Amino acid sequence: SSYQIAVLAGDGIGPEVMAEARKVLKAVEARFGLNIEYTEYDVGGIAIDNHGCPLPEATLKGCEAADAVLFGSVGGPKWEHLPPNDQPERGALLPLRGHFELFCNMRPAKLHPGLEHMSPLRSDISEKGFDILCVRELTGGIYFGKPKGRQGEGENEEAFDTMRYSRKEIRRIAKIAFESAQGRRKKVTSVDKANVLACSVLWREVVEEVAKDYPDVELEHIYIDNATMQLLRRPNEFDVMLCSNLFGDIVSDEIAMLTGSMGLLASISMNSQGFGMYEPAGGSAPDIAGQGIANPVAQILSAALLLRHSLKLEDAALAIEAAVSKALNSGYLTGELLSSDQRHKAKTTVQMGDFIADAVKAG
Amino acid sequence: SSYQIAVLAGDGIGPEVMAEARKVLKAVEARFGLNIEYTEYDVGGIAIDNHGCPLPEATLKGCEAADAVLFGSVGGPKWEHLPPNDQPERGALLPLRGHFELFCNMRPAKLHPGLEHMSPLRSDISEKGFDILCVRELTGGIYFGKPKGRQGEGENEEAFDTMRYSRKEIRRIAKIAFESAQGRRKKVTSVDKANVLACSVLWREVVEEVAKDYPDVELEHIYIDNATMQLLRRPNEFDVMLCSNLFGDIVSDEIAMLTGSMGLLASISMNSQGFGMYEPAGGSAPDIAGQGIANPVAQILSAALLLRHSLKLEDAALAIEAAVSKALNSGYLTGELLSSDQRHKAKTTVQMGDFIADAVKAG
Ligand SMILES: CC(C)[C@H](C(=O)O)[C@@H](O)C(=O)O
Ligand SMILES: CC(C)[C@H](C(=O)O)[C@@H](O)C(=O)O
Ligand SMILES: [Cl-]
Ligand SMILES: [Cl-]
Ligand SMILES: [Mg+2]
Numbered sequence: 187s188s189y190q191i192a193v194l195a196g197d198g199i200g201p202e203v204m205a206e207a208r209k210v211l212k213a214v215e216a217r218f219g220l221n222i223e224y225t226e227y228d229v230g231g232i233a234i235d236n237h238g239c240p241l242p243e244a245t246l247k248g249c250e251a252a253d254a255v256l257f258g259s260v261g262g263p264k265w266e267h268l269p270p271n272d273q274p275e276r277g278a279l280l281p282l283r284g285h286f287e288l289f290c291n292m293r294p295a296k297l298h299p300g301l302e303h304m305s306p307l308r309s310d311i312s313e314k315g316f317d318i319l320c321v322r323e324l325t326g327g328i329y330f331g332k333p334k335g336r337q338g339e340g341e342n343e344e345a346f347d348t349m350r351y352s353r354k355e356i357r358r359i360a361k362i363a364f365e366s367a368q369g370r371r372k373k374v375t376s377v378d379k380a381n382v383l384a385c386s387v388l389w390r391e392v393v394e395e396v397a398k399d400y401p402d403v404e405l406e407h408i409y410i411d412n413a414t415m416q417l418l419r420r421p422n423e424f425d426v427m428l429c430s431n432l433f434g435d436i437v438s439d440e441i442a443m444l445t446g447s448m449g450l451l452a453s454i455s456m457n458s459q460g461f462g463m464y465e466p467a468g469g470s471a472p473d474i475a476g477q478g479i480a481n482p483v484a485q486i487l488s489a490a491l492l493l494r495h496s497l498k499l500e501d502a503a504l505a506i507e508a509a510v511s512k513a514l515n516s517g518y519l520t521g522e523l524l525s526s527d528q529r530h531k532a533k534t535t536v537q538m539g540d541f542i543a544d545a546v547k548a549g
Numbered sequence: 550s551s552y553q554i555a556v557l558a559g560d561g562i563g564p565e566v567m568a569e570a571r572k573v574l575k576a577v578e579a580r581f582g583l584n585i586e587y588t589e590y591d592v593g594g595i596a597i598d599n600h601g602c603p604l605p606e607a608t609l610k611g612c613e614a615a616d617a618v619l620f621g622s623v624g625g626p627k628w629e630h631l632p633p634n635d636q637p638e639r640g641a642l643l644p645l646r647g648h649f650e651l652f653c654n655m656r657p658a659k660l661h662p663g664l665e666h667m668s669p670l671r672s673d674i675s676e677k678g679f680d681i682l683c684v685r686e687l688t689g690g691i692y693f694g695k696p697k698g699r700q701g702e703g704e705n706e707e708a709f710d711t712m713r714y715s716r717k718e719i720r721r722i723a724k725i726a727f728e729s730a731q732g733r734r735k736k737v738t739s740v741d742k743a744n745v746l747a748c749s750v751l752w753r754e755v756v757e758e759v760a761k762d763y764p765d766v767e768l769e770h771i772y773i774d775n776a777t778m779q780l781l782r783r784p785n786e787f788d789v790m791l792c793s794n795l796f797g798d799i800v801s802d803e804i805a806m807l808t809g810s811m812g813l814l815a816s817i818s819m820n821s822q823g824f825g826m827y828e829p830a831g832g833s834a835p836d837i838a839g840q841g842i843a844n845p846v847a848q849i850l851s852a853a854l855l856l857r858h859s860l861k862l863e864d865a866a867l868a869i870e871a872a873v874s875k876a877l878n879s880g881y882l883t884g885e886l887l888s889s890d891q892r893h894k895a896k897t898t899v900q901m902g903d904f905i906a907d908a909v910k911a912g
């Protein structure tokens with residue numbers, strides 16, 4: 187029968203980049219003979235506007251019915267005044283990850299051939315290339331530990347957060363990182379702060395337990411502060427990074443910016459049953475919404491990753507990725523990936539999606 | 550009467566860079582007429598070897614008697630096998646900061662004129678320069694919060710750490726950052742994760758309270774993940790960074806590596822009474838110990854910062870800083886700051902300290 191995908195475009199540039207993803211997906215469906223049905227739901231600011239909250243119960247029910255979620259991005263100035271709790275990102279993302287038990291986040295990032303000069307790294311460093319998959323534990327640690335809150339008053343008012351991890355939680359995310367490394371370059375770098383945090387001591391211990399089953403994968407451990415330095419100096423030496431929730435938030439961002447090409451980057455958030463949400467690493471960029479200049483590649487690649495990881499449609503995911511590569515390598519670029527003297531030749535969001543969709547067809 | 554300085558050279562390159570600092574200090578004492586008495590104590594690995602622990606009670610008593618501590622660096626492979634608890638860094642640094650209530654850490658970092666090309670940043674970014682003072686809260690947050698430890702067994706064995714901050718703790722570190730900014734470029738960027746952590750919500754709240762007293766200082770807040778990205782893209786736009794304990798550990802390291810010149814960088818750790826410990830940001834670098842090639846500038850500048858901050862000897866601190874600048878600007882460089890084709894002309898650790906000491910004298 188039909189695959190089912192819930193589409194949660196969100197705010198800002200979400201809807202316009204989503205239209206291009208839907209356009210490429212349709213080419214893929216025709217080429218591979220796939221029956222996929224789509225249903226659309228509000229989330230983030232458009233959900234606050236139509237329903238009073240950023241994650242409506244009907245949107246949760248709709249995601250629950252689907253095999254995966256193709257997600258855009260949420261947030262905008264319209265909602266920034268609200269309490270931390272009621273806002274599009276915190277109010278939709280954290281509840282979605284807890285609700286669907288999405289303990290696995292994967293952010294692939296590489297310098298694409300021919301676009302290494304976009305990196306903010308010195309040219310002798312960026313020309314060496316890099317390709318780093320960040321595996322981040324997404325439903326544990328300090329994001330969801332209890333107790334959390336505040337007590338007390340005046341100068342003695344105090345807040346607290348609790349970072350907690352169990353062996354079962356660390357084992358499952360570490361297995362993902364070692365499995366991923368087996369299909370890449372067989373190296374995992376686990377990022378922790380084991381000279382300070384009890385949680386990191388246990389993290390490092392359990393990752394060493396898991397690593398016994400993968401002797402052909404090199405394991406190394408690095409402290410979070412040093413990691414931010416070593417990603418500047420030698421990013422070509424890392425393959426998979428394995429991080430807790432807070433340290434993976436930080437490392438994946440630094441690596442994303444090291445690409446210089448964040449409009450290409452996508453994010454996988456998956457549970458143990460293979461259900462997942464797939465979305466650009468970049469945000470809703472409300473400053474360019476509706477101008478038709480946003481780079482749709484991150485949203486289109488989020489759809490390829492949805493086909494590979496949730497639907498196990500490997501050839502279909504490969505086809506989208508090949509088509510994107512063709513556009514980038516043929517220099518068919520949106521404006522943020524061009525120099526100021528070439529920027530007048532930027533391709534629009536629609537031109538990009540048209541090229542990519544045509545390439546999937548042409549086979 | 551005499552000022553009193555406890556000298557804790559530590560392991561690896563500590564003693565050799567310390568000899569150069571002592572050499573410059575002696576020039577300064579003669580030029581400014583200062584009476585300073587020094588006493589030496591073991592800490593870190595040499596203290597483990599002579600006394601069985603990395604922070605002997607007699608070393609604590611000796612620091613307590615002194616007006617400030619000129620500290621080297623601790624750690625080495627000889628001690629890496631030991632339990633996390635018993636090792637030179639964790640065992641000496643964390644106890645020293647708690648013991649002496651050193652809640653204020655300050656790490657100044659700039660691209661020095663004429664050495665911008667050392668940065669790992671693209672040349673169009675590094676040539677714009679940067680000068681960023683990181684103010685890091687050093688005795689609170691998750692480093693020292695309780696409860697911390699583990700319970701449970703097998704797959705349900707779990708560890709925990711607690712991040713805690715009070716209004717009094719945030720106020721005092723924030724005042725340092727705003728005062729510092731008043732004498733610099735009047736901008737504080739406070740780094741937090743207030744979309745996730747209760748402690749960051751309170752941090753941001755208290756920093757806004759403190760900021761009312763300094764309306765001529767620009768305040769902005771940035772999330773830790775985004776900060777690691779924005780330091781790559783626009784480091785010339787930051788002046789003072791104000792961070793909690795874990796986020797300041799991370800941001801100061803990334804900025805240090807962005808200099809490309811970590812052998813120049815020093816660290817201030819101070820209590821509310823003006824007592825402090827002053828040390829290189831870089832480590833004991835056991836791989837080059839005794840080879841007489843280590844760059845002593847970080848240790849020598851740690852002594853200038855000891856004179857300015859603990860002893861309020863502003864002209865003496867200025868003199869050391871001018872003398873260092875003279876060496877760097879005259880191209881009198883140790884090897885790690887030279888290209889491979891010029892590296893044969895590296896100056897030794899002693900040559901550096903001699904030049905700098907002579908410059909202080911020459912006035
Ligand atoms: C919005 C925020 C809660 C979120 C997180 O911290 O995970 C974001 O930074 C991310 O990386 O997806
Ligand atoms: C050694 C470690 C405990 C220490 C810290 O985390 O503060 C170090 O990274 C530092 O920055 O001084
Ligand atoms: Cl965490
Ligand atoms: Cl902290
Ligand atoms: Mg993030």
Ligand SMILES: [Mg+2]
Nearest residue numbers: 411798799802
């Ligand atoms: Mg550190």
